[PDB]
Amino acid sequence: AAQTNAPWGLARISSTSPGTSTYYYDESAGQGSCVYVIDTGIEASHPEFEGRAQMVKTYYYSSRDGNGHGTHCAGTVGSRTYGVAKKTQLFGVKVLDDNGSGQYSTIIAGMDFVASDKNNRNCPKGVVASLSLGGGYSSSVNSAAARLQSSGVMVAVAAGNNNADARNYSPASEPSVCTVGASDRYDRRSSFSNYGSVLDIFGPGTDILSTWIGGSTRSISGTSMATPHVAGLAAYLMTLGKTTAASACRYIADTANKGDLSNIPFGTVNLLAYNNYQA
Numbered sequence: 190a191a192q193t194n195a196p197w198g199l200a201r202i203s204s205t206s207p208g209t210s211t212y213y214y215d216e217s218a219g220q221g222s223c224v225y226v227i228d229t230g231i232e233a234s235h236p237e238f239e240g241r242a243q244m245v246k247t248y249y250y251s252s253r254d255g256n257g258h259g260t261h262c263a264g265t266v267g268s269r270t271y272g273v274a275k276k277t278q279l280f281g282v283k284v285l286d287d288n289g290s291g292q293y294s295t296i297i298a299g300m301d302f303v304a305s306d307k308n309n310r311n312c313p314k315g316v317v318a319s320l321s322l323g324g325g326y327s328s329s330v331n332s333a334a335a336r337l338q339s340s341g342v343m344v345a346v347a348a349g350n351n352n353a354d355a356r357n358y359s360p361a362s363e364p365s366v367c368t369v370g371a372s373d374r375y376d377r378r379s380s381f382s383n384y385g386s387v388l389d390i391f392g393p394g395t396d397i398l399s400t401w402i403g404g405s406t407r408s409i410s411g412t413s414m415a416t417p418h419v420a421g422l423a424a425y426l427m428t429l430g431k432t433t434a435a436s437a438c439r440y441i442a443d444t445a446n447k448g449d450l451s452n453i454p455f456g457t458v459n460l461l462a463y464n465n466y467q468a
């Protein structure tokens with residue numbers, strides 16, 4: 190399948206090269222997989238989700254995304270225009286209030302929630318979780334990411350936005366999950382991407398068009414926007430049969446565009462997520 194005049198990041202993760210605007214992907218498109226967006230919530234009523242999205246948890250007084258962040262990230266995963274994995278089932282978990290703030294202990298509670306709940310859902314092709322959030326190093330926050338991953342969920346986490354080595358941030362520094370940095374449409378590291386040997390992979394994160402609340406769209410920027418490209422990609426690769434929840438971060442790295450970003454500091458991977466469909 191081909192989707193012309195696509196947001197640049199969907200074209201990128203289907204290209205070897207920058208500078209084009211079609212998104213090339215196999216039509217199975219994540220059918221039979223499940224992606225949990227653990228964030229401010231998802232405006233499931235957005236027609237771009239077409240009935241595939243459900244809130245299933247909150248730790249606040251409403252499950253609605255009253256911020257926009259969770260809806261943007263979820264759209265990149267799996268909205269019909271703006272998503273990677275256009276036939277995946279989306280499940281929301283609201284661990285952030287309507288300003289973007291979550292206490293750690295609640296974020297932990299969300300995370301163990303997914304390791305349990307996946308067992309209430311129909312996900313024959315595999316389960317992913319997408320965490321576009323974080324704060325300073327915590328062993329506990331990190332332990333809750335290793336548990337979620339260990340429970341057979343592909344876990345994808347934002348490296349962080351301080352232009353700093355990510356080993357000081359959580360859940361990014363955790364080893365066993367898939368820590369995602371960001372890039373721009375000219376294959377530069379985005380100016381705000383944390384870096385450091387704990388990163389596994391980079392994704393489009395600067396000027397990412399996606400869904401927003403009210404039924405609407407916007408372009409925003411962050412390792413948060415990069416993260417759901419890799420989550421959606423992993424859902425897409427499960428569904429096909431290329432990899433598994435426990436093998437997908439390795440698998441994406443093995444198949445990435447290798448050398449191609451500017452400004453990988455020394456010691457940071459220079460790997461860019463790629464679906465290997467067109468070549």
Ligand SMILES: [Ca+2]
Pocket residue numbers: 364365366367368389438
């Ligand atoms: Ca890893």
